[model samples]
Target chain A: SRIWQSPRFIARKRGFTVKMHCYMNSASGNVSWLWKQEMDENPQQLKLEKGRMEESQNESLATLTIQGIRFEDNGIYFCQQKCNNTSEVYQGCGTELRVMGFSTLAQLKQRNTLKDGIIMIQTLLIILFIIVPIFLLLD
Target chain B: GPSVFLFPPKPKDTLMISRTPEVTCVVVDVSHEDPEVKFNWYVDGVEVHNAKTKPREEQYNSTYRVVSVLTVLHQDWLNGKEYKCKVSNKALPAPIEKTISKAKGQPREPQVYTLPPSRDELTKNQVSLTCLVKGFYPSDIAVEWESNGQPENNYKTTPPVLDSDGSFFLYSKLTVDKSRWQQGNVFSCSVMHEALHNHYTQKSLSLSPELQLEESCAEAQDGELDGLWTTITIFITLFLLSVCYSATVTFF
Candidate 1:
């Protein structure tokens, strides 16, 4: 009658895997769907998405492992089930998943710093194509 | 200006822990369904950055309705945390705010009673023993029947029906013929639920020319007390040992 979700809030670094669990107190039902909802997005139904979502279940517990956690994977994940003999569907409390490794400021700063480095390479290409040929002609 | 209305007349302040609870603030009768109409969510006093907002334009009226849904953890809801939905539009005088919190109900234990077979049914050679488990909160319970210390499979236990008092009740019935009932075999109803003292409670009955409740049925049937018989035997043995020691001392 009750399903308990573990690790109420989980934080994993980007590229790492995060596993969510749903433990049902009764074995009257089997896991039916796993939903992942990000902020400002509708709930996305997760199936056996190979390499992205892995699912395992028994009589009373269902586990979902999200492989290669991405920054886009930051969302709330919950499991739902329907009783074998009934039409009613039940859902867990839902687990909050946070994928780290992308700070907005850090990403912006990295891009700005990489731009100067890219300019040096662009200058070297110009020297090889234009200035070097001009000097050769002048010789 | 956009008129903000909750699905319910008032804000849905109560959050039931059992369900995946979400609160939506609907902004209807808007001039446009564009991003110009912004929606913001807050829990307690902090802003909720991830609230989903969707805008729909009416075909007939060309008016728009913006719906914003905020999903929160069940644990946070049960802790009496508050959620606020604020709707902002360029046409509105100020931001519209609706706050929600406070869930109700407490877990209650069930009161169990048994109904003996009626006289009319007993005369017809068919009988039914009914177990009435009522006043239980949350409706999570298991009921079983036993005949002469053996469990009876396929016994009928009804799904819990809500009572007027917000508690729940259910029935478990055991059917048999008068011939078996008169044989003096015991029929018992066992209830296992989280609300009970030890998560187990039972009541048993047997026929002594007429129906009677078993002595143990007057109190809780504790499986752990199965060691009581052994404990009494050990005390007798220890008493016998003391007598033997005193006798040996007297003889010496």
Candidate 2:
């Protein structure tokens, strides 16, 4: 198996597409792709059913694409291949992806707005039912 | 000190059309004497402009040895050009030139193997001599047959076909009188391919029964710390017996 020759720290700004590719010198049998987040005990097997991110595991090559990257996307991606000749469950190394600054500011604002609306609604409900009952009988 | 030589040999530096190729030539400072060496690269017949040389130095004879590589794109090589690397030193009289020519990929030569003629293949008056030539390149091959050092025109050649890895396979056959086949004269098959520059590979037919014995050592339990005589006797006995058991078997 060949090493993943992508970049060291894939420095990209927000909303920039980052496509990481890994390939072997020669093609072999079964292969799988895994993404290990920081401090994760086990890496995840990427497939079409896992939405948002896109990945393809061709015969001897693999590619992972992140449509819009955030700081949370910073982690190590491993491309592994299985050789029938040897009992290698998988053979490959990892490449790190680091997403650069301020890409999630709009997302943080949306979360906070939704949080405030929920708090206002809860306060109104509690006050309106204060004279009604305790635990919905709040008298 | 021995004279310094160029890398890629002289014949190996190649350029081929139809390939957006990697045309790179290397001239290294192989001399390790007190004399200092330098390199100059040329393309077409003119000296290189916008000259950028990447120098990689190494250890030689516990002294400094330097190598400089010249990289040309496929478009650059296709400039109706032939180029050379000229190296001169403080000690040399004239510069030595190594030209880059069309690169060639050689096949695994041509392997010739004979099969035992089947009962159907052998008849009363005529028998066939079949030879398999395998794993060649360019799919362009010429096959020639000879019986006892004399050329024979009564031979047929198979159309060369593509191999699994895009090499080639060819077969040649000769039908001859059973008298010659029974007498077992030396028959030879010759292959001519584009990869062979001056000489083609020739292989002679083997009429003696192929004697292969894989189990001779396994069957032998006797051991004597001796030479020649005992070894020759065992070889003769095994050789005779193996004629009947010539089908190859490999043991791990």
Candidate 3:
């Protein structure tokens, strides 16, 4: 009925491994993983692939390992389990993964620059419009 | 403005008790240096004299807090009598009153649901069974786990949590080792509450066949619409900037 997840929050740099643990409270439940990006309306199922992703299970504890963490991995990783007898699905409190790297900082700077540029252009237009209207009034 | 302020308790924020319930009320945001605060207690509109009040506790903001505790006898609280706390201060324009009563709050029987372990745990040496109890009132609850009709330990129950609708919910988890669960041992969770009155709700679970995992692609198409919208915004901003620039140049 419940999956307990730990390391409620974790930070990893690019190309590093991000691992989180979920302890399932049911014996016959199937463990599945979900990836929820920030501000996303829907979460996608986590795919297990060799060398990229894997889930290791020992008794009631299961660990999800993501190798070569990328900037795009900055979001919540959730572990969900459902028992075979019932349709009820239980999800662990998700672990938020913060990918720390200069790559994100660079993108952030670009966005800030674009915002500043727009503000400056709009300010210049406002001043020009006021000045030109004054000259026409004097004429 | 009043020198000290105490917030009134909402129905959801009231602390509920199970048996011989103990209740405490805190007076927060007291700004006066040596303000005298008095607390009074009443049971169903009759004054009760057995409550204790603590000295003001200092806060980081140089404000203070005062707490008063009331302990009700088992028979008194069980009878669902109304309890009230009144705090009076000279700094306040009027004395504030807070009230709580089991009879007024109402009680609901718990609905129980059981969950078995996941498929991945089938191969492991241990697994867990969970029982969910929800939509109960008064906050006091007991969850007992049993194996093969015998009482079992190695189980944990969470404190009853207050829901938005003012009801209570909790989870009772039972952990069992691999050999026992694999042997098809039956695990049952029995929830005990006063609301049920001489009866309890029991839910049982056991290991079963593995469920099929749904197949779906993990890698979704990334940022197609977002990139397109960003490009459109950039073009619109550029067109507007160019129009403003040409107009400025022609006028100058």
Candidate 4:
């Protein structure tokens, strides 16, 4: 009763791409790969499935690529291997994909400058109505 | 010849006259020197009404006595109009004129009522508290809760409920978990309405460690019962083996 196992499995976010790599081994001839998302039961949630193996390639290496990583891709992911006439199933330890440290400081300063410009215009209008007439009458 | 001083040196009384309906003005003369004085009222720097002079027979001390009551009817008195009351004497240099402007003062502060949760109701674990405030106009209300010196952001605000009496009210609720109650934390609900006006309510409660221990002990007791059942079964099997050994010895 040998089982397929991955010694080193990793999934990391690099810029815009999510790279995944794992090693699998099976004593049985009927081996397949399957990927499943976590929130499949929630009716309001959408599930994304990818990386299905069509045939057993005797070679136990598998690599998956997910381009254009988005916020919705931030969740629990599973890597599964099926063997023994599809009766035995093995899943790798779940990986939590968290994206962080992306935003820069220059974008924040630009937003503050636009807000200050609006306040300056409002102050000018109030001065034009209240102070200018009084100055004109005094002159 | 005597000098005359204006009764009210500065305009001390300001009356807000609305323009929705007709405007009415009433003048009462309270001077003792000239009791029977002629009165004239001006609107927007223009003389509008003049009342005839009357004898001041009401007072006996003043050598010249005159008291007069004047009534003026005007419809557009509050259209940024300035009004002046003038009292004249036959032997005076100039008539005493007092000007009053129709400027409206700031509106009164609206009455407000806030409802918040009481102290001793907020505890860590299994206990929840909510604060609600009502009876505020122009729905500029905010609420917050702090626990154990750390601010809690688990709050929900309801839409403003506009009442028929021209007042608005809003409600907010905050929920705390059991772990928060166990920390012997303080829960505070603060409300800020309109500009810098604010009010706060607070509550504090401690968790019962004895009850928490008892709950965990009950769960351990269930596991202990399973172990006791297995031990009893093993003892029965040992007793059966000893009986079989004695029977085999007697047969031998």
* Candidate order by decreasing TM-score: 3, 1, 2, 4
Measured with C-alpha atoms, the lDDT of residue B105 in candidate 3 is: 63
Residue B216 of candidate 2: its Cα lDDT? 20
What is the C-alpha lDDT profile of model 4 across B101-209, one tens digit per residue? 4434322223333343345654433555655565554444456667558888777878878778766666667666544443234566655533333222344433222
**How do the residues B84-150 of candidate 1 rate in per-residue lDDT, one tens digit apiece?**
8787777677888987664446778988898888777756866888899999875556777887667
Candidate 4 docking DockQ: 0.01
Enumerate residue pairs that collide in model 2: A133-A137, A133-A138, A133-A139, A134-A137, A134-A138, B14-B103, B15-B103
lDDT of each: 0.71, 0.63, 0.70, 0.46
Q: Residue B242 in model 4: shift from native, Å?
A: 9.3
Q: What DockQ class does candidate 2 belong to?
A: incorrect
In terms of lDDT, the best-performing candidate is: 1
TM-score of 3: 0.40
- The better-scoring model by TM-score among 1 and 2 is 1
lDDT of candidate 1 at residue B126, scale 0 to 100: 69
> Candidate 3 residues A8-72, lDDT tens each?
67765556676787766446777888989868877898767787988888765788888998776
Which scores higher on lDDT, 2 or 3? 3
Best by TM-score: 3
lDDT against true structure, model 2:
0.63
In the range A15-120, model 4's lDDT, one tens digit per residue, is 4555444345434443333433565542122234455212224344445556666566665544565665766666554444555333244544654675586568
Candidate 2 vs candidate 4, lDDT winner: 2
